[PDB]
Amino acid sequence: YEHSTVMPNVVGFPYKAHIERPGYSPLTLQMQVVETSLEPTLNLEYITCEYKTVVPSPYVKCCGASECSTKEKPDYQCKVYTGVYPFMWGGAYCFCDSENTQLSEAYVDRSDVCRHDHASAYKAHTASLKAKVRVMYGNVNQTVDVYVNGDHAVTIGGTQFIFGPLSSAWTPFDNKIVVYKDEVFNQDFPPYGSGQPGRFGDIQSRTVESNDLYANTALKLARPSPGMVHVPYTQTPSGFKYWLKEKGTALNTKAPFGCQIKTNPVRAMNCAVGNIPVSMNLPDSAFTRIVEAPTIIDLTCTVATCTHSSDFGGVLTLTYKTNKNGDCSVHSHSNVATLQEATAKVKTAGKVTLHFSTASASPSFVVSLCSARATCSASCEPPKDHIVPYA
Amino acid sequence: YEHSTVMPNVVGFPYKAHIERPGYSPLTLQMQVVETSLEPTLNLEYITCEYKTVVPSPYVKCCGASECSTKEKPDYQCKVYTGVYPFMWGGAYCFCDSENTQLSEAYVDRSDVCRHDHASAYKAHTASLKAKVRVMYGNVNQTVDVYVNGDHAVTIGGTQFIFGPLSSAWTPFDNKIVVYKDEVFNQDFPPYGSGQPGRFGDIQSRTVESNDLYANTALKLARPSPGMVHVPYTQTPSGFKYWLKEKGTALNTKAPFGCQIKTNPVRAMNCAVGNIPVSMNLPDSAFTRIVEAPTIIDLTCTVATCTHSSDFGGVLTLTYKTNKNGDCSVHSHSNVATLQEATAKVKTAGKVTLHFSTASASPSFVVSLCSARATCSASCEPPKDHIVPYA
Amino acid sequence: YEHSTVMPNVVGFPYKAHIERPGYSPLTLQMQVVETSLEPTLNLEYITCEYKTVVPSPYVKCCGASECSTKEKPDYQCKVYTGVYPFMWGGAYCFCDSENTQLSEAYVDRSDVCRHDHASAYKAHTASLKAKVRVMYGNVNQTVDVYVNGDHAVTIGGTQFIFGPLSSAWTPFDNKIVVYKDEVFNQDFPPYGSGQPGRFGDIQSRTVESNDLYANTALKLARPSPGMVHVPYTQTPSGFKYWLKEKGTALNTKAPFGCQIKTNPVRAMNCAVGNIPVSMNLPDSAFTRIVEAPTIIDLTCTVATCTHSSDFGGVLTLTYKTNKNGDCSVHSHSNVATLQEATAKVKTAGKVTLHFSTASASPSFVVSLCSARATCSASCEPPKDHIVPYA
Ligand SMILES: *[C@H]1O[C@H](CO[C@H]2O[C@@H](C)[C@@H](O)[C@@H](O)[C@@H]2O)[C@@H](O[C@@H]2O[C@H](CO)[C@@H](O[C@@H]3O[C@H](CO[C@H]4O[C@H](CO)[C@@H](O)[C@H](O)[C@@H]4O)[C@@H](O)[C@H](O[C@H]4O[C@H](CO)[C@@H](O)[C@H](O)[C@@H]4O[C@@H]4O[C@H](CO)[C@@H](O)[C@H](O)[C@H]4NC(C)=O)[C@@H]3O)[C@H](O)[C@H]2NC(C)=O)[C@H](O)[C@H]1NC(C)=O
Ligand SMILES: *[C@@H]1O[C@H](CO[C@H]2O[C@@H](C)[C@@H](O)[C@@H](O)[C@@H]2O)[C@@H](O[C@@H]2O[C@H](CO)[C@@H](O[C@@H]3O[C@H](CO)[C@@H](O)[C@H](O[C@@H]4O[C@H](CO)[C@@H](O)[C@H](O)[C@@H]4O[C@@H]4O[C@H](CO)[C@@H](O)[C@H](O)[C@H]4NC(C)=O)[C@@H]3O)[C@H](O)[C@H]2NC(C)=O)[C@H](O)[C@H]1NC(C)=O
Ligand SMILES: *[C@@H]1O[C@H](CO)[C@@H](O[C@@H]2O[C@H](CO)[C@@H](O)[C@H](O)[C@H]2NC(C)=O)[C@H](O)[C@H]1NC(C)=O
Ligand SMILES: [Br-]
Ligand SMILES: [Br-]
Ligand SMILES: [Br-]
Ligand SMILES: [Ho]
Ligand SMILES: [Ho]
Ligand SMILES: [Ho]
C-alpha cells in the first residue's frame, strides 16, 4: 500500500490526518514544516570602501625640466608644470629668465578602514534549498530533512515515509547582490573595472588584502598656488560614503512571501512557496484529513501609513474576533495589492499587522484572514526623493 | 478517505474524472483552471522623459570681469568668456584687458510634457501568484482560489477539497523592468545617478513631481558669436526620444509559455507552468480519469516568415483535419526550436497559427498537435540592424 | 481506478513500485528520468570582437587651411594642426606667407577576424523544459516525454498513464548571458550603444555582417612629429582581448544542482530540481513502493583544495565501503556549505569526488552519502586577484 499526498511549504500551517487503520486505536498523524533554508552560491566579484588619496612630496625642479613617465598605481596621475616654478623663497632657484618645471603626482589606495567597514558585491545563484519537517505520528515525534535536489525515504513509527522533492525553489535573491554588514541588497552593482566616481564602486578590489586595486575618483591635478609649495587637486568625495546615504532599505525587510533574510552564511529562511509531497504504506481508506481552522468574524481593515510605488510601503491592521487562538492564512483578492507575509497568528486579543504593497495611490483591495474577508481603502504618498549626487 | 491528484496549471486543458461511488448515479467531476495572476512588487527606481534645456538671460560685463561659482542645478554649467564681440556703452570704457567678459550659464529640467508622456523604471520581484479554478462537481459549479503561498481547503458538493499550493511560480518579468504606456520591457536600465547622454535615462528623477532631477546631457557652453549677444552651446538630442526608436518589441508579445502581459496593475496572466494538486474524501477506487482529446490527422507545417536570433521571430501554420472541435496542446520535440504558446484551439476549419523561436538560420524541427506530429523546415533572416546613436 | 504518485526529477535515482494486482503474476513497475532539456529563448543583443583601427590618407596641406567636418564612420575623429616643419617644401608648390597645415583623421571597424572569433551577448529567458522518462512496466519498456507547459497522457502496457506537468522549471541561465565558443557565461554585459574602451563590448554590432557598428575605443588624434608625415594617435588595446584574460570560468562547470551546460542549441541538461507526478488505472492497494539503496559505511571526508568565495571552489573526496555498486544521493546538512552535484555513483572501489562551495574560510560541514554521514573540515584561500585593466 502506498498513499500519496502533499502538504504546503509554509512554516506553521500544519497537515493533520486521522489515520483510522482497522485494527484498533486510531492514529493521529500530523506533520508540519518548521524551517526552510535556501542558500545561494555567492561568487565574490569585488569589494569597495572609503578611499584614501595619496600624494607624495613634490619634485621642485629648475629649467632643466623633467618629464614623468607612467607607473602602475590606482588612478595614477602626474603632470610636468612648465613655468609653474613657484619662484623665489631664499637663495637662487633657476636663474633662467624663462621657466623651470614642477613634477606633481598622486594616486589612490583604499582607506585604512576598509578592513572593518566595507561592502561586498557577490554574484549569487540558488545552490540548494532544504526544509525541516516535524512529523508527529501517533506517539512518536521525528524530524526529517527534505530537499529539492532529490527525495528522501525514511522509516518512522514502523511506517515507511518518502518525502518527494520540494515542488520548487524560489529565491528572493537576484543574480547580483551586495552584502554590507548584517544587511543584504539586490543591486546591479557596476562590474569590476567599471566603477564610476562618486558612486558605489568608486574603487574596487577583489578582496580587502587584494592587490588589484582599481579606482576612478576623477583625481585632477591643479596648478600650484604661489607661496608654500604643495599639491593642489580636485576629486570626488568617496562614492562609498554617498552610497551609504543612498542605498534604500535592505532586502531584510522587503523580502516577499514572508521570506526572512539572514547574514552570516547568507540565506533566505521560511520562504513560503510550493509544496512537499509525501507517501506511506497505508490505503487511502484508512486516511482521512482533518482541517480545524480558527473561525474568525467581524473583520476590519485599517491602513495606517502607506507609500506609493515601493516594496511593501503600506501597513494594514486587522481587528477581529476569534473563537480559538491559532494560526491563519492571509491573502489579497485584488491584483492591485500584494501582501508580504503569507500567514499570521491569531490571538484572542484581536490585533494583526500586515505589510502590503501596491503601485496605485488610493487603492481599494480586499484582504483575508482565513475564511473571513474585509475591504481596505487608503491613500498613499509617492516615494521619497532620491539623494542627488555631486551636481 | 483521501484521494490525491494533480491537474495541469494551464488555462483550458481540463481535468475530467468519472467518480463512480458505489451507491447509485455516477458523478462526473471536472475542474479546470480559468485564469492565472502573477503580480510582482514594483519598486519604482526612477522615471525619465524628454528633457528641456534652460538658459537664463546672459550677464553682459565689462573688463571688470566676474567669475562664476557653481550652483546646484541639473547638469548645471557656466563659463566666463574673456574678450567677446566689439560693441559698447559710452565710448568703449571697460579697458583693463579682456575688453569684455561674458558670464554664460544653462542647466536642465524635465520637459513640460513628462507628466503625460514618460516611462518608468521599476525594480520588480514576484510578490504572489494565484489562480482561479472552476470545479464542476456533478450538478454544482464553484470557483476556488488557489495560491503558492499556502494551500486552501474548501467544501463543495458536500465533499471536502484541498487545493495544495501551486507547484511553482514562474515569472516572465526580470528583476529590472521599464513600463511605458501599455507596454512593458525587460531592460537593464542604467541605475539612478548614472544616466548617459543620448541614451535612455538621459535625465532621471524618482517621480515626475520629484525634486531630485538628475541629468547628463553633455551640455557644453560655446563662445558667443559677434553680432547679437545670445548663448551658444552643444548638447545631445533627448536620449528618451532615441530610446523610443531603439527599444525593440515589448514583452507583451514575447512572453514565453503563453504568458499574457497586462499593464494597469502590471502582471502576467495565464502563464502555463506547473501543476495544482488536490485531494478529496473518496477512495482511489471510486475515481477513474477520463481523457477525451480531439483526434487529429494529416498534419502539415508551413513556416511563413522567420527571423533569426530574436524572441519568437518565426511563425508556423498548421493545416489539419479534426474529428471534433476542441483544445489541443502544442509542443516541439527538437531543442533547436521553441514554441511560444503551449496550447491551441482546434477548429474544424483546419487552421492553427503558432509563434516559434530559434537561433539557427535554416532549422528543422518537429511541432506537435495533440498526438499528431509534423516536420517544419524554414530559412530565417538575421535580426534587424540596430539604430546607431549620435555618432 | 486512479492512483497518483510523484517521482523525483533527477536523472538516475529511479522509482520502483511492486504492483501486486490480485489476478496473477506480480508486475514490477519502474520509471526513471534519463534526460532533461531546458532551452532558453536567446534574443541576440549584439556581438563584439577584436577591433581594427583605420587611418585614411593624411591631408598634406601647405598654403591652405582645409577644415574637417564630421563623418559618419565609427567614433570618427578629426583634428587639423599647423606644424610638420621639418622642411619638405620647395616654393614652386607652396610660396606661402603662412605656415603649414595638416588634417589627420581615423575611425574604427571590426577586425577581419570577427567572423571566426567573436563572442555573443544574448538576452535569454526560459522557453521550455522537457524530460525523457523511461518506464519499464513488467515486460515492456517505453520512453515518454514530459513537459511543464502541459501534461501528457499515454497508454503503456494496456494501462493508462498521465505524467502531469513538471513541478517547476529551474534555470541556471541569467537573463543576460554571453556565448563565446563552446563556453557560456552569465555576464551583465554592457547594453548596446554603451560600450566602454578597454572593456568587453569595446565595439558592438548586432551581427558580424551587420552595418550598425558602434565603437568607443578612446581614439585620440596626436599632432604629427617632424620628419615623415604620418598619423599619430592614442587608443586602448582591444577590450575583447582584455576580456579573454579576465572572464573567469564558464557556467559550464559552475552550474548548480548538477546541471550540465551545452552549446550548440544552448541549453541546460539533467538539471535536478523538482518532481514529476504520474497517475494510472490501479488501486493504491495493488501498489507498493520498493526502495533498495546501496548500504554504505565507514564514511570519510577529505578536502583536497578549496577556494574561498567562488562558485564551487572546493573539492571533497569521500572514501567508504559499499555492499552493492549503485547510485546514491549526496547532500549537505550545513548551510555553510553547498554541494554542486546532487548524486554520485557508488562503486565498490570506494572513491567519490564532489565539488562544494562556501564563503567561509575554514568551514566545517557534514556531507552525506545516501544514509551515511561524515564531517568535513578544511581551510580555504581567498579568490584570485583580478586582472587590472589599462591603469
Ligand atoms: C514532539 O513535538 C510536539 C509538538 O512540538 C513541540 O515539541 C516540543 C518538544 C518543543 O520542541 C516545541 O518547540 C514544539 O512546538 C511536542 O508537543 C509539545 O511539547 C512541548 C513540551 O512540553 C510543549 O511545550 C509547552 O509549550 C507551551 C506553549 O504555550 C502555548 O501552548 C498552546 C499553543 O500551542 C496554548 O495552550 C497557548 O496558546 C499557550 O500560550 C507552554 O505553555 C510551555 O512553556 C512553559 O512551561 C515549560 C515547561 O512546562 C517551560 O519550559 C517554559 O519556560 C514555560 O513557562 C513556565 O515554565 C515553568 C518551568 O520552566 C513552568 O513551571 C510553568 O508552568 C510555565 N508557565 C507557563 C508560561 O505556562 C511548554 O513549553 C508544547 O505545548 C507541545 N506542543 C503541542 C503539540 O501543543 C511533543 O511532546 C513531541 N513528542 C512527544 C509527544 O514526545
Ligand atoms: C458549469 O459550467 C458549465 C461550463 O462552463 C463553461 O463556461 C464557459 C463560458 C467557459 O468559462 C468554459 O471554460 C466553462 O467550462 C456550464 O455549462 C455551460 O452552459 C452554457 C449555457 O448552457 C453554455 O454556453 C452557451 O454555449 C452555447 C453553445 O452550445 C452558445 O450558443 C451560448 O451563447 C450565448 O450565451 C448567452 C449567455 O451569455 C445567451 O444569452 C445567448 O443568447 C447565447 O445562448 C444561446 O442562445 C440561443 C438563442 O439566440 C440558443 O439557440 C442557444 O441554445 C443558446 N446557447 C446556450 C446553450 O446557452 C453560450 O455561450 C456552455 O457551453 C456550457 N458549457 C459546456 C460546454 O459544458 C454549466 O451551466 C455550469 N453549471 C452551472 C449551472 O453553474
Ligand atoms: C528495459 O530496460 C532493461 C534495462 O534496465 C532491459 O534489460 C536489459 O536486457 C539485456 C538483455 O536481456 C541485458 O543485457 C541488460 O543487462 C538488461 N538490463 C537490465 C539491468 O535489466 C530490458 O530489455 C528492457 N525491456 C525491453 C525493451 O524488453
Ligand atoms: Br558583473
Ligand atoms: Br539601479
Ligand atoms: Br542590455
Ligand atoms: Ho553638486
Ligand atoms: Ho553621429
Ligand atoms: Ho545590469
Ligand SMILES: [Ho]
Ligand atoms: Ho595601466
